[PDB]
């Protein structure tokens, strides 16, 4: 159940395999990619180096072939991508999407529950 990642913006993110449907019930990687595409200027602007990993960890979640419980990113990955960029959308009449919320994300502190995070 691990298809190779085909979404262009999600190349070089640390992992190369994903599963569908994702949390947003996208049927194919074409459906999700058209929603991640909207962020590629935000990535190119580089308002947050964690924005790259955060989106892909949500739209193209990691598909470990050994391990079959969903691995989400930590809330810290979201809070850095948020506050690092969120002012940019806020200045120009856009808004941090409700899909990219950080509140209910698994914290890095909890030792039971995993969540991906680099630095």
């Amino acid at each position: 159940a691990c298809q190779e990642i085909t979404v262009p913006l999600c190349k070089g993110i640390g992992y190369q395999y994903t599963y569908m449907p994702n949390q947003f019930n996208h049927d194919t990687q074409d459906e999700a990619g058209l929603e991640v595409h909207q962020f590629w200027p935000l990535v190119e602007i580089q308002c947050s180096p964690d924005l790259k990993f955060f989106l892909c960890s949500m739209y193209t979640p990691i598909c470990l072939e050994d391990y079959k419980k969903p691995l989400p990113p930590c809330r810290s990955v979201c809070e850095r991508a948020k506050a690092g960029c969120a002012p940019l959308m806020r200045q120009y009449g856009f808004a941090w999407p409700d899909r990219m919320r950080c509140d209910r994300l698994p914290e890095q502190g909890n030792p039971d529950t995993l969540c991906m995070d680099y630095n």
Partner: antibody
Amino acid sequence: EVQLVESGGGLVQPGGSLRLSCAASGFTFSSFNMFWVRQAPGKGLEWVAGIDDDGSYPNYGSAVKGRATISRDNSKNTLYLQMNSLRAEDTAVYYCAKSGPRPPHTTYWHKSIDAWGQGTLVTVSS
Amino acid sequence: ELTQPPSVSVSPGQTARITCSGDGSWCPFCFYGWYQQKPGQAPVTLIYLNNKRPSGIPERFSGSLSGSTNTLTISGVQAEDEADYYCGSSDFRRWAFGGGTKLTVLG
């Protein structure tokens, strides 16, 4: 096959009124945003009016605000543009322009121009 | 507030590159579109969402993004590619178009 036909173009006296109508086909009309873009003869494209899918949030350009009103009626697949107090600087070819693909169920998305009508010339002369 | 070169000259078979960018206040994370206007014809969109081709546009037209600058790339330029190429951008509040670029095919 996407088709956007603009009617109602012709002569309008200065300080007069204008009503344009764009008839859409080949696509689900109510599923895309809709814009008016004009081009004065020999000049560049200029942003005029824009509207959402249902018609709750009209958007207008600088040289147009307060004088124009964009609207749609998704029953007969028609877009409209009304204008008042037309000056000479309003003579232009007026284009009907369809929106491109948008990701559903998200509040973050950007507009694009997917299709253009053939345009109708509006001459502002006495 | 979109700027693009007034004119680009290329030889048949060569590759033309037209650049579009936003000024010191334009939405730096917004997308760029490209529309081709052949003489006397209505505009036709080649590129939307920075590097996407609508159905029917040939694949020799391509878009690329670098910072706040998009580049339209036309490979295998033929004399028929003579046209005005306008770029456009939207920040959800308004639209902004560039002055246009005239493509002349030399020779």
